[PDB]
């Protein structure tokens, strides 16, 4: 099944920040394709671009809990308007548990009927 994770990239950053937290996300999970957003904007796009593709399970790296976490309630909101199965990983130390919640419970909410 089709895996996209998608980072939270800061207010500050610019090419460089966006590009080494992807690097991590893509040593952590090889097996996604790894996206970067710093506005609305950005978040629609790759949010609407992996709908295009069919992401099947989108796992969106950055916090939920300040005015800044806009960019990641957004992709979720477009995905999840989709139907696929988005989750946000706000965390650097539960962070294997809570991505693996993306390629273990996807089947538990999409093995939902006969095929």
Same mark, same amino acid.
């Given at each position: 099944?089709? =895996? &996209?994770?998608? &980072? =939270?990239g800061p207010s500050g950053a610019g090419k460089?920040?966006?590009?080494?937290?992807?690097?991590?996300?893509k040593e952590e999970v090889p097996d996604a394709e790894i996206?970067?957003?710093?506005?609305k904007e950005d978040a629609?796009?790759?949010?609407? /671009?992996? /709908?295009?593709?069919?992401?099947? &399970? +989108? +796992? &969106? =790296?950055?916090?939920?809990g300040s005015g800044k976490s806009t960019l990641a309630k957004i992709v979720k909101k477009i995905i999840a308007r989709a139907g696929a199965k988005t989750i946000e990983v706000t965390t650097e130390e539960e962070?294997?548990?809570? +991505?693996?919640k993306a390629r273990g419970s996807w089947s538990l909410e999409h093995h939902?009927?006969?095929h």
């Amino acid at each position: 099944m089709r =895996v &996209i994770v998608v &980072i =939270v990239g800061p207010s500050g950053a610019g090419k460089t920040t966006l590009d080494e937290l992807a690097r991590k996300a893509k040593e952590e999970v090889p097996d996604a394709e790894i996206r970067t957003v710093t506005t609305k904007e950005d978040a629609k796009r790759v949010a609407e /671009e992996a /709908e295009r593709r069919n992401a099947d &399970i +989108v +796992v &969106i =790296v950055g916090p939920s809990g300040s005015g800044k976490s806009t960019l990641a309630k957004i992709v979720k909101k477009i995905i999840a308007r989709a139907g696929a199965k988005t989750i946000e990983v706000t965390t650097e130390e539960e962070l294997r548990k809570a +991505v693996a919640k993306a390629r273990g419970s996807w089947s538990l909410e999409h093995h939902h009927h006969h095929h």
